[PDB]
Amino acid sequence: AEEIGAXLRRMADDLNAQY
Amino acid sequence: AEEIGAXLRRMADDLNAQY
Amino acid sequence: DDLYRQSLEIISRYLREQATGSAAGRRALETLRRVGDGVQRNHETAFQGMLRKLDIKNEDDVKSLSRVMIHVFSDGVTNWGRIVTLISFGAFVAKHLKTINQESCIEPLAESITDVLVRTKRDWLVKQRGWDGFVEFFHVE
Amino acid sequence: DDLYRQSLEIISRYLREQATGSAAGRRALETLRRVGDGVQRNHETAFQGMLRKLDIKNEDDVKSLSRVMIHVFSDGVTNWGRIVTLISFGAFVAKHLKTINQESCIEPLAESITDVLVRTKRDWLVKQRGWDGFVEFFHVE
16 A cells, blocks of 8 residues: 555656656 | 745744754 | 646546546646556556555545555655656556446546645645646657 | 654654653654754744634644645655654644643644654655654754
8 A cells, every 4th residue: 555655656756767 | 824834844944954 | 726626627537538538738638648548558567456455446435545645755755757657547546446337437536636646745736837847747759 | 653653652742741841762852852942932923923823723623733734845845844843833732722721632733743744754754764863863962
């Protein structure tokens, strides 16, 4: 729950650095 | 309400930069 | 209030179109589609796994998802990658809820996502120029 | 859960002592006193003005204060200055609630403050080494 949160946060930060 | 929030945020940031 | 309504509009319309098939707001939706769809594609397997771990039994069950989003930002970092990733996961979840129940609505889902986003990041969004800033960050040529 | 209980403990004890007169946790309380008391002193006039703007009619009325704290961090910035400022304003508010009603408790106030802090900033606090990090930031010689 918190811890699917952290692993959305791998995919988002590593989308953030695609842009 | 939000906007006493912003003016806690003058005093906190300018405590943060005391330290 | 202005940013809330505008965000609700965009997020709601995206989730509606995703659950079914249908100024900046037009641009924002056009951007949300391109990026959000790609997120969902690249990470479909992972998204399905996460959906398995959480519950969300129906349209009104969002408290679970809210905690996930709040936890995403708990490291103190904010960026558009995270905001759009959460919306895309919201779209993925909206698709799921519609599959299990064809007459359920996305409206409560979209409000929960908006609520977290806008209430927790209002000044940051404003400083990033809201949805105009969103469009510019993901702009491609 | 560990960080929640530890934070609840420290914040609760500080507010209790403030509303009345009474490892890192001991150090944290000792630091919270020095800094928190100073915040309240330097900004007493401002604090009173803010207290006038908000409502807080009793021990259980915290929803108002919660929104204020959430809005403080909405610009995406986190630091100890802000965390300790909010706790100190919480102490100030605890004093006020005790004055209007001598048999009211700080316990709900402290939980609301803790709730916001820990739930919204859990990973940041962990990365800053929790209350040990708090003690080190404000350390004086």
